[PDB]
Amino acid sequence: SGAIYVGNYRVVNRHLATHNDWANLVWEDSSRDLLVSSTTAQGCDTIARCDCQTGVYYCSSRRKHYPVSFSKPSLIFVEASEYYPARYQSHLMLAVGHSEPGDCGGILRCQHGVVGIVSTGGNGLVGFADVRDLLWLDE
Numbered sequence: 001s002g003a004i005y006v007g008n009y010r011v012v013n014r015h016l017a018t019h020n021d022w023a024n025l026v027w028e029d030s031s032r033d034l035l036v037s038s039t040t041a042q043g044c045d046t047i048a049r050c051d052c053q054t055g056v057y058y059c060s061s062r063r064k065h066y067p068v069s070f071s072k073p074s075l076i077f078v079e080a081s082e083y084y085p086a087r088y089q090s091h092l093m094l095a096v097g098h099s100e101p102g103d104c105g106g107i108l109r110c111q112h113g114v115v116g117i118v119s120t121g122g123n124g125l126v127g128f129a130d131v132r133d134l135l136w137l138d139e
């Protein structure tokens with residue numbers, strides 16, 4: 001679990017969105033596993049606007065942060081799950097690092113701010129949904 005809170009927006013994994021997220025829907029994209037809902041309170045976070053390929057993510061299944069080198073956002077095949085059929089997930093960045101299903105929502109940050117959230121993983125890999133291209137989150 002986890003979310004990004006920026007301005008009057010809440011960014012979560014689309015497969016973990018609640019009934020309240022869908023009732024306050026701003027934008028969603030199944031191909032990115034992202035959903036953004038509106039909030040009444042002002043959010044705690046800053047979004048990075050950069051091309052960093054290193055950062056640190058929070059891993060809830062270890063209660064620890066880990067440094068990672070990650071690939072640039074790209075289209076990556078993701079096997080079928082209870083939430084989606086087998087498909088290409090876009091804007092996904094991979095890195096070597098521990099992850100389990102409940103780690104989705106953990107934030108990846110660089111020195112400039114929030115880069116994205118855990119969305120996939122397996123076999124010593126961890127995949128992050130990028131949010132740096134969503135310029136409208138800042139206005």
Ligand SMILES: CSc1cccc(CC(=O)N2CCC[C@H](C(N)=O)C2)c1
Nearest residue numbers: 033078081099100101119120121122
């Ligand atoms: C098996 S270790 C693991 C680590 C992190 C996550 C997972 C689960 C996983 O990748 N998916 C299930 C939820 C939706 C995801 C998606 N973005 O399509 C795919 C598994």
Ligand SMILES: [Zn+2]
Nearest residue numbers: 050052110112
């Ligand atoms: Zn950066």
